[PDB]
Amino acid sequence: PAYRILKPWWDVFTDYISIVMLMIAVFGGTLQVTQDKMICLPCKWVTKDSCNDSTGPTGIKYDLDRHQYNYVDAVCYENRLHWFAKYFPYLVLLHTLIFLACSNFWFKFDIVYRLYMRQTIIKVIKFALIICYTVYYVHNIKFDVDCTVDIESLTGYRTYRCAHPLATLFKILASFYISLVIFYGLICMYTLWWMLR
Amino acid sequence: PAYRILKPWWDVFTDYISIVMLMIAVFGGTLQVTQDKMICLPCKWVTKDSCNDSTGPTGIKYDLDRHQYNYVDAVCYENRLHWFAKYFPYLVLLHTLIFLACSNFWFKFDIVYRLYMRQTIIKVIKFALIICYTVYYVHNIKFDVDCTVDIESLTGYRTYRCAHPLATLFKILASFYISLVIFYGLICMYTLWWMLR
Amino acid sequence: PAYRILKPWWDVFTDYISIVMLMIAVFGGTLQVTQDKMICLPCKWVTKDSCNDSTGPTGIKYDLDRHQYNYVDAVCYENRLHWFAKYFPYLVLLHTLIFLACSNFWFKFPRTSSKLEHFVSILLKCFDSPWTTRALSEGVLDKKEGEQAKALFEKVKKFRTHVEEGDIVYRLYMRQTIIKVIKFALIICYTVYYVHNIKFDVDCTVDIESLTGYRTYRCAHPLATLFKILASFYISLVIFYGLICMYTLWWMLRRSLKKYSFESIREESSYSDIPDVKNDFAFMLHLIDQYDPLYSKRFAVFLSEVSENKLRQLNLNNEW
Amino acid sequence: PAYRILKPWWDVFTDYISIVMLMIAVFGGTLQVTQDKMICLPCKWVTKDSCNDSTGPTGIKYDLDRHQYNYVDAVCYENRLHWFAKYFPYLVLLHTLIFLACSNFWFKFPRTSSKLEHFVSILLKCFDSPWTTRALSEGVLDKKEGEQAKALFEKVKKFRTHVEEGDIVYRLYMRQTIIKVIKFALIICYTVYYVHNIKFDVDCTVDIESLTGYRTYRCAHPLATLFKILASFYISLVIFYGLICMYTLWWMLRRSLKKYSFESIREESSYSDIPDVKNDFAFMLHLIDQYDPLYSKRFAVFLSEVSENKLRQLNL
Amino acid sequence: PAYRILKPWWDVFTDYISIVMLMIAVFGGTLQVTQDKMICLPCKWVTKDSCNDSTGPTGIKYDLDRHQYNYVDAVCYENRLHWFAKYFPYLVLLHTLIFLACSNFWFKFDIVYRLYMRQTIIKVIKFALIICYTVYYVHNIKFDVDCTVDIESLTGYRTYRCAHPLATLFKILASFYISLVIFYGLICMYTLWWMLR
Amino acid sequence: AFRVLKPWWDVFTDYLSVAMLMIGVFGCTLQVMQDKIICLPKRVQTVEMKGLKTDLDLQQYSFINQMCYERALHWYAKYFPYLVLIHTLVFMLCSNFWFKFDILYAMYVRQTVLKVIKFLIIIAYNSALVSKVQFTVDCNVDIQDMTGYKNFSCNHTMAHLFSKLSFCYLCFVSIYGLTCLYTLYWLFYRS
Numbered sequence A, B, E: 001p002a003y004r005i006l007k008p009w010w011d012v013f014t015d016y017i018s019i020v021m022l023m024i025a026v027f028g029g030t031l032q033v034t035q036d037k038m039i040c041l042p043c044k045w046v047t048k049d050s051c052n053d054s055t056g057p058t059g060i061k062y063d064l065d066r067h068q069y070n071y072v073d074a075v076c077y078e079n080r081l082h083w084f085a086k087y088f089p090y091l092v093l094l095h096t097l098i099f100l101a102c103s104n105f106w107f108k109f110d111i112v113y114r115l116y117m118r119q120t121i122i123k124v125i126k127f128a129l130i131i132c133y134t135v136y137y138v139h140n141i142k143f144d145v146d147c148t149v150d151i152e153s154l155t156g157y158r159t160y161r162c163a164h165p166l167a168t169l170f171k172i173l174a175s176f177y178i179s180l181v182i183f184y185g186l187i188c189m190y191t192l193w194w195m196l197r
Numbered sequence C: 001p002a003y004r005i006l007k008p009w010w011d012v013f014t015d016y017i018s019i020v021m022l023m024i025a026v027f028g029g030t031l032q033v034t035q036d037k038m039i040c041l042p043c044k045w046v047t048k049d050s051c052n053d054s055t056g057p058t059g060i061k062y063d064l065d066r067h068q069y070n071y072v073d074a075v076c077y078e079n080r081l082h083w084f085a086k087y088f089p090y091l092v093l094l095h096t097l098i099f100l101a102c103s104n105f106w107f108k109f110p111r112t113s114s115k116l117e118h119f120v121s122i123l124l125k126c127f128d129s130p131w132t133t134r135a136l137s138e139g140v141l142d143k144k145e146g147e148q149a150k151a152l153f154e155k156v157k158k159f160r161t162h163v164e165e166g167d168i169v170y171r172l173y174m175r176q177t178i179i180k181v182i183k184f185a186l187i188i189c190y191t192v193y194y195v196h197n198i199k200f201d202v203d204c205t206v207d208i209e210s211l212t213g214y215r216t217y218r219c220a221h222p223l224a225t226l227f228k229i230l231a232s233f234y235i236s237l238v239i240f241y242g243l244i245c246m247y248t249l250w251w252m253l254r255r256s257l258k259k260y261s262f263e264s265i266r267e268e269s270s271y272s273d274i275p276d277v278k279n280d281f282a283f284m285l286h287l288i289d290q291y292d293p294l295y296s297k298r299f300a301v302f303l304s305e306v307s308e309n310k311l312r313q314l315n316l317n318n319e320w
Numbered sequence D: 001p002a003y004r005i006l007k008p009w010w011d012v013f014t015d016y017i018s019i020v021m022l023m024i025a026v027f028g029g030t031l032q033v034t035q036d037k038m039i040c041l042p043c044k045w046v047t048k049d050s051c052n053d054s055t056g057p058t059g060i061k062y063d064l065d066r067h068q069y070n071y072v073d074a075v076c077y078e079n080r081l082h083w084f085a086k087y088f089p090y091l092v093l094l095h096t097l098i099f100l101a102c103s104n105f106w107f108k109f110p111r112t113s114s115k116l117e118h119f120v121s122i123l124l125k126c127f128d129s130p131w132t133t134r135a136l137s138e139g140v141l142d143k144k145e146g147e148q149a150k151a152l153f154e155k156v157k158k159f160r161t162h163v164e165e166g167d168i169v170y171r172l173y174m175r176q177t178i179i180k181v182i183k184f185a186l187i188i189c190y191t192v193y194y195v196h197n198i199k200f201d202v203d204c205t206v207d208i209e210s211l212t213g214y215r216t217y218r219c220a221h222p223l224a225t226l227f228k229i230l231a232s233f234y235i236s237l238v239i240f241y242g243l244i245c246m247y248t249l250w251w252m253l254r255r256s257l258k259k260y261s262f263e264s265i266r267e268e269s270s271y272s273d274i275p276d277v278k279n280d281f282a283f284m285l286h287l288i289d290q291y292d293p294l295y296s297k298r299f300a301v302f303l304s305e306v307s308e309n310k311l312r313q314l315n316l
Numbered sequence F: 001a002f003r004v005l006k007p008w009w010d011v012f013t014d015y016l017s018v019a020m021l022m023i024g025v026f027g028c029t030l031q032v033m034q035d036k037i038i039c040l041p042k043r044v045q046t047v048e049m050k051g052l053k054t055d056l057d058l059q060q061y062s063f064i065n066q067m068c069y070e071r072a073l074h075w076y077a078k079y080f081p082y083l084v085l086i087h088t089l090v091f092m093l094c095s096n097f098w099f100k101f102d103i104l105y106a107m108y109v110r111q112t113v114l115k116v117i118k119f120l121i122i123i124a125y126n127s128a129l130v131s132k133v134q135f136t137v138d139c140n141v142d143i144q145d146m147t148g149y150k151n152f153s154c155n156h157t158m159a160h161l162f163s164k165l166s167f168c169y170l171c172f173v174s175i176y177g178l179t180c181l182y183t184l185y186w187l188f189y190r191s
């Protein structure tokens, strides 16, 4: 409407970054819903719950059905995959939704100045929390994950070496997502700099 | 339209909570309609309808085909999984739709004030029933599911230990759902007292 | 809206090319999300981690389960497939989004946005003014239309004073064009140099003998030549874009767009008092001349002061 | 934007054909994306790199895994399947996109788009002015309506002066239609001489003998026939499109569009000095004739100075 | 637009039936792209292209790979299935497009009266032809197909007893279509009488 | 705006019909899934248990799946969402029948009576045939010549979901018919 005079340059760029982060969020959520799984092969040689990793070549016979493989993938997705690697798109969904709620709260609600200042402080500290909490855990998204779930009485093995296919692409999302957050904070920095000057 | 003067902040907040509840219901229904299943392996060595849970390691051959495995998964998915763990998205969808119908009741139906009074009583008592039934049944969802369907005449085993992959998701979804309902109810509760005083 | 007057033919061309580029990006993205895979087959006879490539014929047995084969496809899809063949559509989406943001950058930047809306509003409402028809026809003047013509004269003088001081819109359009042409150069360079790495046959050596039994595998990437031709098609689009941008850059360096001259209009008309506008005024008038000279011809009268004196005489006779 | 009066029947038919070609391209593309598989089975008996094809029957065992089959499918789908059978939907996407761009170039080219919207706006203004009705039926005139009538006369004069000078719209429509006809000719030539290469049974010889053990494979292409059907169907539509395009070019050589004759309109009406217009003004007058000559009849009375004289004496 | 009040009740009825039969065609096309297959099981007792059919029960070993099964099914589908059963939805889609285009051709172009004459005549004659060709070929949408291709050089069998899965439903879908067209035809004949009044 | 002549029953029926269409779309999406029935043979050839070897291919299993979907599963159990979609289309077509039409009274009571009888027929048929949506199905197809087994036991994967959908559908048509019966009582209570 006519409220564009109340939305400066920083507000417009932050809004556009928020929409772009929403596209990243929904893309990650769609990937998690559709193509997120693991491929887990049992380790033939073991040494106290660890993969020992020890003329023509021949294939190794793991002597397992396809459905026991499916059970191994399900249990090593439930137990030995980190929760953030499974829930990163959903956490990013929550962050984007609450970020839109914070950015556009004063439009749907010296009262206005108080809301504006509170939203600015909240968005700066929330950018700081998001960057720290996502940089800290971003190493949990690995291609190769060694799982050990003790399903010998149902499968016949104790250790397996899973691979997560959509992991590294999530990395390509996550860093880029972090980069967008970085830019947000940069804008916030300038805003705070302007709020100082 | 121009009904924002007739819609105070609690009606708008409850409407937004209902929108979040609706997309939670949609997400749960989508997950259940596409990726929901169970993965069952029979308990090879059993001790009175109970899994006893006991040179290299070789995979256990159950000699069950992939189709027998599908049969076991479906049969154990009905007869032993708790009904809330299966009907949570449909329950939350029904609750969200009835909340929408109740909240938008006067908009197409001092008789108006008495109608809102009765509407608030109905909505708050449904909140009470909802929170009771949800709280009592959140902890009735478990990942590893025992199964005793007695299908020995078709696959050869009696007891099974299945995995329910998205079960935890539903719990987590249910967890978030509780918060929404509480918020909704708490907001609505204030309105009741706001009209009682 | 009514911003189409500020967009010449090259801007419309780039907008449509960017739309088609985004369509390519989305198509490749769903292709990579859903159908992108590798079919990796081990080499039974190898020589120093290299495939030797060696009574009816019979098949070769590998003794690999379906799950081992999936692992082999996954590992040789990540470790030995070129990253370009995997993340080309995401790169195209990024390039398209940056191009779209650059194209609409002066539109949403408030300092230039205010100038743009003010210029567009008074240009369109000056076009709608019948004083232009009455003047280029040359009293024929109603009290109300004379009043609104005087108000528009005041508004035009005020906007001319307000916008002559700064040339920020011209600099912003310069920056957008230069950024677009350099990004075209970079995109052409790396895409041309990396498009040869999208090949159908890939020899992967991922060292998973402890899990499968074979060191090296031979993989077929089904969506390779497709990802070639799309990329080739994509390259063509970028070339067009660049050429268009090149011409635009040339158009903004052949003559000084910050010095407009009304010589033709003030020569063909009776008014010879219309001065030459400068800076952002001149730049948006040149952009409008790229649309048609007609808008500039009908606004040149409102920019004149002899026409203002004639209108003031008309209103003086109207009131008295 | 009220441009529909400027697109004649041939333009509307070509736009509809291009829309349905877009639909064909989308359907073929999504089918090729999702379910375009090739099913390759080796042939046991080889006769100089050729397949010999020679109580209870027993199945033939090749000792091939489910991935070996998927590899030979990919290899003989890429190397040995003809490229048209694989990229026909992308070809029709490119062709229908270029056809749509050609059709809407003069709509989106500002040099002719500005002239077009100018011409449309003044035709629409003259459509509702009542001096037109008084002149065609040939008096009372309110001050306001007489004011916009004289103003519209002045816009008509100035806009005739502005438009009559050049012929950029005419030459651009010339270029558009000649490009469309030459590209339709190329499309028909290459598509006709390449379509027969869609075949359900393909015999591939790819030499993956080190990876599978067999040299020559026989492959089914379950989406060939459908593509064939779509190809035939697509070809038919281009026929229709092609025919329509020739009509336009034939129309644009039927008479010089850079001149217009007002003989009929001024002969049936009283005003006998209506001047014969030329160039771009004549060309868009011809297009409005192909839409509705009533617009030309309604506009033709503002071009005469005799009607200016009558309007002046009526206003006096 | 400006044609809302000209249409009588029968025109609105035809428009509604056209919309229903439109989405019938579209949903059939979605079924055709999604689940259109057919499963052929080779005949163990073949005597000159004829399936002879002359403790606990046991299965039958055909010794065919899954890919030989895929080749058999694809070949028996593209060589031994009638064009009608294979291309039911594309042909009804073409009928929808042509019927709708002829119903609205006079908008896109007593010349109007003669045009609507020609459109009504085309509509009724295509109703007649569609009914004739549909009821003449409705029998070929059947499950059981005894395919015989003689690709024994690749499979070792020559006859297969396939069963088309999405056929009987297609049949009832086709049935629905003709019934709809029947009412359409009835309405069409009314229009004919009006335009022959 | 006819909302003044739209009492509470008409708006309630409109929202209920929207719910019917949503239920039918969800059921059609359920039927979209390829995996529909899962069939295993009967009497197939601390104590350690061993899996029974059915000696069947994947395509044999699929063949028995579709055959027992044919000849053992009930037609209502296979096209319940289909009937639901068709019948809600009928509901929204004949719900505005009085609006889209002593003749005013006559067509209004005609609309109410037609709606009431459609409701009653739907209730009777659904209550009669809802019990046929079962999970465990016994299938006696004669495909012994191709598979080797003449008797099979199958499971319908979404039969519980179809029963729950039918319960919700019956509740919705019950509210529909209650409000329409109130409409008929109000219409025929006074002249």
Ligand SMILES: CCCCCCCC/C=C\CCCCCCCC(=O)OC[C@H](COP(=O)(O)OCCN)OC(=O)CCCCCCC/C=C/CCCCCCCC
Pocket: C027, C030, C031, C034, D025, D026, D027, D028, D029, D030, D031, D033, D034, D035, D089, D090, D093, E026, E029, E030, E033, E034, E035, E036, E037
């Ligand atoms: C030239 C480009 C033009 C535009 C094309 C855009 C490309 C779109 C990219 C993909 C679109 C859909 C993504 C699907 C990913 C999921 C794949 C999946 O689940 O498996 C494939 C799955 C199973 O196939 P097979 O196992 O081969 O079948 C058994 C063999 N008898 O295949 C499918 O059928 C996919 C599901 C069907 C829906 C996809 C769309 C297909 C086209 C629909 C036709 C009718 C649509 C009508 C349009 C309605 C508009 C109002």
